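Deliverable D4.2, example record:
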Amino acid sequence: MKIEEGKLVIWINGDKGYNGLAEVGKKFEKDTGIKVTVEHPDKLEEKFPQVAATGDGPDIIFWAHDRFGGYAQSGLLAEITPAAAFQDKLYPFTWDAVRYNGKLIAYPIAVEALSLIYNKDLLPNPPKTWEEIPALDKELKAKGKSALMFNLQEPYFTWPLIAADGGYAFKYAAGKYDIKDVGVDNAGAKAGLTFLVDLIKNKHMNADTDYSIAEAAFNKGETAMTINGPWAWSNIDTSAVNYGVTVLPTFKGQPSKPFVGVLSAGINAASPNKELAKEFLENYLLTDEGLEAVNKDKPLGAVALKSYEEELAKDPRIAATMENAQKGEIMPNIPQMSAFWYAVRTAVINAASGRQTVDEALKDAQTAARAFAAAGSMSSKGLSAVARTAKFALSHPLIAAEIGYWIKGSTNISTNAVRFATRNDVLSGGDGAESNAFRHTLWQSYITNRHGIEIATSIGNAHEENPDVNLRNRRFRTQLDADQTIDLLNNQIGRSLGNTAPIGMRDMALRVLEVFYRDGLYTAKQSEDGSWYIDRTKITQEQYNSLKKFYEIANDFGRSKEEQDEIMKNAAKRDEKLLDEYEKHWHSIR
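Output generated by the structure prediction step:
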């Protein structure tokens, strides 16, 4: 029998006290006669999905709730229908962690959350608000002791501050998660990350702090506060640093919202012992006696059962973990969280380091997070042009600042190329024309010349919706289809021209003009029947001499001396008019 009827097989991980479970299973055999065998295979997170689909799994699983959402999406978990009396015996917020499609899919067993850990360096009135942390810093800075230190590289530790004023991963309602509503780049999230970066700017915290660096500083007494979970209590314990666990600080009067991970017990949909499994979990495991047996083998932290939680809350550390969990955000059980972790991790690092602004980092994060949420893949294939451009900014923040977008009067690479191509309207205007060809070729040429071929092909292909279009075809039904291949081909000739020793925009603009005159650049043309064909088009010698003369009198911005001197003197007027106004306050010679 793929799953033997008349006995229960339980799969739990090896770090959660698998021997206490079997003792509860012993009492089950004593009173019922149904054998309970507890096994702890490795790769249990990945073993069950394969065996369940073919129907060869275990009867019961113990694992975190975040993975169970994908299981039910594969139809591998049976619906849990508890009675009202038993359902009220467990904390209501724990049931919301095991709900998919509005239907209960598992039993909550335990709860885990991030919490604040302090030292006698500040034991008294530990900070209750995030806003007073910078003030206490100096106080200890004097004693030459840091104030707060927690890991900043991983978003799991930085999310509680970001989410407080309004921030989430995916919206939750009626037991369902909406993959199209993400909480990055909202007003509260921007405020939360801005406070984090402002602490770094004011040198209350260093952005390169690791998990190990934060752990070492607190264990050695060098920092008064750290943010971490119950897994690190053992290493701190050993260290005589006198540590207590309390509430996470409040931001803007609203509590921090750490991600909450609830240990859950599910039932295989292929198990013929569903009713026997429910009796074991409801009447034996999720009791004060049964949970104590598991608690003794491994501490199990805070517990969903209110009766045992109130007993376990006598330890202030466990009570604080439950309190932060109740104030926190249940980590979504949908598999689309893979998008959230990738986008948020890079955005937070870029903003904290200063390589990217908070608003731009979160905007690119939300753009990328929603994109990967669809297509269910961390792969970029088939994504939109906007998504890949945002992904490019997260991966290469500083370079994306230099490769800007068209802004009137800006001196970035993207706008300077437009100034070269649109000089005196010499080049033909419009999509699929001479001006567009010169822009793309010069734009790719300079990026290649200063950053490399692979950085240029990434940004060039990102701006195109389908960068893998067969370039052999030259006939297109729509001009938009034609212009896509025109840009792809003209990007290639630009990268070849740019793989040289570094030069300026002006001298690189001369190269594109030379090739445009003698070799030509791709341009769209409409034949009869409405179809569009593309071929390399040479430029008239006038156009060539007109632009070359102006290019030879210009800087690397695309402007002549007169055009630059107008702006420089205009800015001098603005700069010096303010100076004269300031000279009113302190009476000067002028």
